[PDB]
Amino acid sequence: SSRHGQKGVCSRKWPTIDMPFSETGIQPDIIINPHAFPSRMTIGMFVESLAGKAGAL
Amino acid sequence: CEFKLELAADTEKLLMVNIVEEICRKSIIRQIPHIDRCVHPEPENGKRVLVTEGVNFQAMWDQEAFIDVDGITSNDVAAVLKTYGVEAARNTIVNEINNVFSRYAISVSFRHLDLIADMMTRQGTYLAFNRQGMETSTSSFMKMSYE
Amino acid sequence: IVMTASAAIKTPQMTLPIWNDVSDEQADTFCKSISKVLLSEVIDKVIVTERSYVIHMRFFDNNEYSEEYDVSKEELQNVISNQFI
Amino acid sequence: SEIEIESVQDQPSVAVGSFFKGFRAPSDTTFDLYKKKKSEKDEFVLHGENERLEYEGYTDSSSQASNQYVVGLFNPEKKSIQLYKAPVLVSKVVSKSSKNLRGPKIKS
Amino acid sequence: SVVGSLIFCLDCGDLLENPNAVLGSNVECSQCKAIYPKSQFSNLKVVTTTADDAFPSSLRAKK
Amino acid sequence: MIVPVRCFSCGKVVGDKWESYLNLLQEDELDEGTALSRLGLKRYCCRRMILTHVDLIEKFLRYNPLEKR
Amino acid sequence: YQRLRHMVNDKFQVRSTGPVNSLTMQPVKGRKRHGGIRVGEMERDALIGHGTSFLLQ
Amino acid sequence: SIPDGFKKCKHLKNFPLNKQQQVWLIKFPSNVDISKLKSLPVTTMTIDKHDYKIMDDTDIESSLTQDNLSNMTLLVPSESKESLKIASTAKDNAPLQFDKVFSVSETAKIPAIDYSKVRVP
Amino acid sequence: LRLTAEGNKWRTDILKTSVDTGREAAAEVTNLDKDTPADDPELLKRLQEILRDNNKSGILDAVTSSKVNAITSQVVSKCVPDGTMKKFPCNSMQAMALSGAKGSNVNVSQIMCLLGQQALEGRRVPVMVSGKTLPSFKPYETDAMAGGYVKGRFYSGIKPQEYYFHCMAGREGLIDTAVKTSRSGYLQRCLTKQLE
Amino acid sequence: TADFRTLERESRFINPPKDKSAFPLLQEAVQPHIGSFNALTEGPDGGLLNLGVKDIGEKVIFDGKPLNSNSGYLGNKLSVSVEQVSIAKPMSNDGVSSAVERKVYPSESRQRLTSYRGKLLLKLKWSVNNGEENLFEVRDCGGLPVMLQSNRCHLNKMSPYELVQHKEESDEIGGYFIVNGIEKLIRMLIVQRRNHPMAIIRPSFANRGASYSHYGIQIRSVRPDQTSQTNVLHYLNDGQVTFRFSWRKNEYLVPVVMILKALCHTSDREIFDGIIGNDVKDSFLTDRLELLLRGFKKRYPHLQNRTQVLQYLGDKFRVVFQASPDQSDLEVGQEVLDRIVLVHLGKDGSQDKFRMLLFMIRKLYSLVAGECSPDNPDATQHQEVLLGGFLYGMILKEKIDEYLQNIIAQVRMDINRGMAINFKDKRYMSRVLMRVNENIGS
Amino acid sequence: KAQGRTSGKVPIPGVKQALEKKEGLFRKHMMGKRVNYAARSVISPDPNI
Amino acid sequence: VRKLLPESWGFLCPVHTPDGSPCGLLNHFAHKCRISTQQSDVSRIPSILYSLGVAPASHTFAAGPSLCCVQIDGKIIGWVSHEQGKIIADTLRYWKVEGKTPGLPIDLEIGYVPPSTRGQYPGLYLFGGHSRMLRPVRYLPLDKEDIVGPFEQVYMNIAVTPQEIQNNVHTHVEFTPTNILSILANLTPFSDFNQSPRNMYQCQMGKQTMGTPGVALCHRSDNKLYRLQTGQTPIVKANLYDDYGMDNFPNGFNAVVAVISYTGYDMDDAMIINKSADERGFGYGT
DNA sequence: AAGCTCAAGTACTTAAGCCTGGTCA
DNA sequence: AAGTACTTGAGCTT
RNA sequence: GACCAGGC
Ligand SMILES: [Zn+2]
């Protein structure tokens, strides 16, 4: 679950090579489907994303 | 309007204006029995209608110089059974259960709402589905597990 | 409906169709009246003066509620004259 | 506007009693006043007596901690006033007739 | 002595009974045994006007 | 609890860079920005491991049943 | 992200065919003692509703 | 039944009674030395450079519109200066009623908000 | 989710017309001159006695709901889709709204435009006995914001009073979602037992 | 924008603080519980324990020794009463012999799977002939669970550096009880505002009688001992307003004009001064109040004095409270007005109670006339919180009561068996208490 | 139908409470039954099959 | 009784309650809300009340809602007029705050209720007892910390920010607007962007997490104890996350996360985990 | 005097399906 | 608490 | 079997 109230179940352990690999070489840890958001109306997760990246850099 | 009353010279102080407030509000000036109030609704869907709370048919039957007596419909199941009989009630139930699902935009095929309605009127009167109507069934083990 | 069998529902109604020729002003004409009417509707105030006591009732202007509730000075006297007391 | 103070009495002179509205006592009736010096506050007790009534009165312990009371005589053909200190006593009238009426210890 | 149909002895504080139920021309308290003449007064009119809580109306539903 | 030996996403070995990150924070009194970038942590992937880490093991070790008070 | 409880290892089970209730000779209530799952009032109408009965019985 | 510590007020001082004269009741704060004043208004007043407020509480002690609705009765020294009689003026023994009741009480002030220091962008 | 640099200007333009709204709903119910200013005392008395009834306040709230709901469909129809920065199909959120795959127009307009009126039992915010809808508002406030109307949006944030109002509308939902299921849950056991 | 604080952190982990905890706000959020439990034994006047157990007063039983005077003499008299209640910090001797005892730390009681308890001690005062001869003695009621981080626990005042030495959590906030190895704590309840007279409207006021309307006034009162008592005033349609209280899981009804004159000697002209005051003009008032006064006369034709009222109370109320056969009903009538009506004003509060109960009545007629709106009982405006410790202190006060009651019962059974009875023998007492079951702690 | 025993403690449910309440005996062990050959678990999406 | 009432602003947290059958019954105090366990000194209140002009209650008969009532803790001290009681309830308020008057602590509530039309019965109340709720504010005439109760709140004007204060209206202001929430409603990042039932669900989930139960774990005998192997201080942080010191108990782990529809197993509420994160220690537990 | 509809008043029952555990008498 | 169905009593009519 | 939890 996130801190924004998205409760979810691990579906499959996905091989490391099949994860879409970024321009920079970073496979994601966790993929989450966009269609969950517009019903649940959570923009704090979209914003916590940016605030997380700009913090880690 | 002004008038006077008198009572025994030896009496208590018993509260009056409360008594007046009590009798004024049961003071039935003119009451065509069970009728309450009138409201003129909107000329919906090309149909032109009046609606009044309370149910009295024998009163509404004398107005036909004004309102038509053939198209008078009710929201009550029983009072339509007292006058028009089991058939107009069986036809009413469907139109009551319909209008509940018509406002929710949902839809329920009338083949179901006919089976319920015909299953209530099988005795000629209006039976619930609760304990009181199931009383007349033949088999015990159906009733014996219910309540 | 289903669960009850109830002979007295919470809020019953009837539905009244009307003729075409009857106007929209005649709509407000016919059924506004023929409603349940309490004498408490026309009473502005009551005075109780004390061994005996006196009753005063100051109504509204006759012309006012004659047009609205459609009651006239005649019946209004008769109903008070009998069942009230 | 302006009012001059002729005299101010510091000693027991008059007293004030609150009984109830329209209160009076028979012509003869006479009231004995009593005084105790508790701290720098003055407490008062009132006791009156006539043929068939008693009268008692006390100064309110709580108000006298923050209220001081003074009776004034006013001369409007002058800008003058005469102040006398007075206690205000909370007082009752007791009927000698029914004071000692009493039922049995228990109606067992 | 008289307040709003309440009448109390000037000595004791008990509640005086019906002046008309007392036979003698003097009402006497059950406590202080003080004496009052019977009639200084007719029973007072008890002016009474009550609230607007109850009733509906045309005008108060407007004004 | 203790420093992870490999960054999860990248796979680089970040496990030996915690101590030296503390030393760099301490002696030269730099900030967190230049300290992480001096060790050769480039991606925002491998930086979050050292940047945000917590050593809770330091609190566990305080309770030792195997020595006197 | 936060990990929660309710790991699937806690929740699942199979058959009743361990011990049985003494009164009615039926599957015992279960999990920790390895009992069964309950057919129910409304579940009983899903059987009849299709017309299927040999599968009800 | 005299209580502990009270002694009967022996020698009662004098009380000169009687557009005629009026009798007033006045409340002062207990901490105020009344024995040294001069002024008095008929609003606001100051006593010993500290400021108070005078209120006409007559309608609380009595009725302004109707007679004989007075809470208080005045008791003056009798013809012996060793006791008190109900003060009267009416040649009817009708008890004196206070012509006026005044309450001298303290007043308070407040300080204005500094919106420059406090309402910040 | 972003509006253009132009569209936001419109949004702020059509919302500013709702600053003075509530008073015009205060005049038509209380039967005054349309121009009676907000703090006028005799206005305040009529706003005062009207409150102690349940029915009368139930009328006033249904009177203001019309206007504050009108402002909403005045803003949204003018802004979105033509105020979006990325146009469909290039915009995914609308591709989720339009295609009916998940969500619907309302859920997108709450992100991109505004929240609109809050509704509890068809009425506005429950009023404390003192005429304050919340400790931070002047007693007997004619304003539209004092009925829970929220001009904010989940994208740019919502002010404290707004959030504390939206919490109520959130709780009522959960409560009623609890009370629904049991009710019809019992009824259906009567029918299927007799019609079995 | 805050920071991570990587250095200052490891500074804290490595060397824990030796002075005071570094997180003041974490220790101030638990203050509700520690404040309540500390409030028992602390406070200038002795807390809730020493004041509460004083409220019970005395329990009286009679021997029946004839003295050889039909004789109204009941025999030498026994007054059992407690005096103070003390709680000793957790202590454990090793087995028997009462060797110098050592402290017990919590980490020992979590592992051993038993409770963490400090001892309870009573000073029990045993008197004869109403103070001629008496016996002071001390007893043991057993172990009493004790909150952590409070004044009766040893961990109070240790610095975080020494919370480690004794094997605890560095910041550990305690604030709970250890029962048989589980950690149990009391949770806070919301009761009515203490010492305020809410105006109520509830439908259940209607079914309690024929003429009861749904108006009412409810007051919940509380003593210095934190025990509570509930007092209600119902308004009947015919003008009678009744007083109601609840005692020992029973409910009773008393006319209010009775209690008004019961409190302080008074006459009705003063009551009418108290309720209506300067409002005599209004007709809605004098009428209701006259039908209120007239009702007390001619209902009970003879009561001319406060005392004659008190004794009438004592006749009916002598049975319930289980007063001793020596007390004249005149006295028991005075037990009531201390133990029920408006208890928060004390036993000298007669003169103030007489004002409070009038003010209620005025506020009740003002509720009938519609001039004031009924208080909303659902709102937080009218509510307070009932802390854990202040619940934990009421119950002990009730159990000491049931204890004294139990002793009194034991002596009474010792009588009707007919054994020789001597109340000047202390050894008789030490014989008596053992037969009674004394464990309060368990 | 039984007079009180110590006014509390709950009664020992009688044979008429075996088949006359909430679940009773007719709707617990008959209208539904715990069954052999059944499993239960969490579900997860599989698009393939 | 399950509605959220506005009279609870600042005491009971609006957001945080567990749903299900308990929903609305359980509540949590705003993290600044304090509960007073001491009996304050009421001794010198009556004298001051007398020197403010309160007539003695022992005498001077009077009654009726037409005039003010001044009380203490269930004793009637005196009667004074309404606009007198406003001068009092304002003055006594100030002498409480500045602190130059002895025997009048700041914990005391001043509850003045003005007479109105068919509102609550008026009066002026003083509550010094045990077990009352109290929350701090910032008193505007001066600038200082003050204490407001639930009963004196409804009638007084509390501004949220210094930017919104109206002239000649507000007598008080909050320290910070976050004083109205609970502890775990602060630990949500950007709780004002999310929809409210989502904030509530979060408040509940965060209490079911597999966390660090304690550092004592080897000395503790508890029946079932969950613990997480590796925590991290979150990057997006609330300042209150430092004061209460949650960093002694790391609750979770950061992740590099992409919002995309790619796999096809991740739809609706499902999610996907990189297989080489787990095997390298991501999400392990004991 | 007597009958029988009249009326209010006195007893009696049900209130969604699951699964997990948790301590305890 | 909401609600129904069942049941006892005194007025009123032949 | 009775009380608090917890899940849809
Ligand atoms: Zn008399």
Ligand SMILES: [Zn+2]
């Ligand atoms: Zn990496």
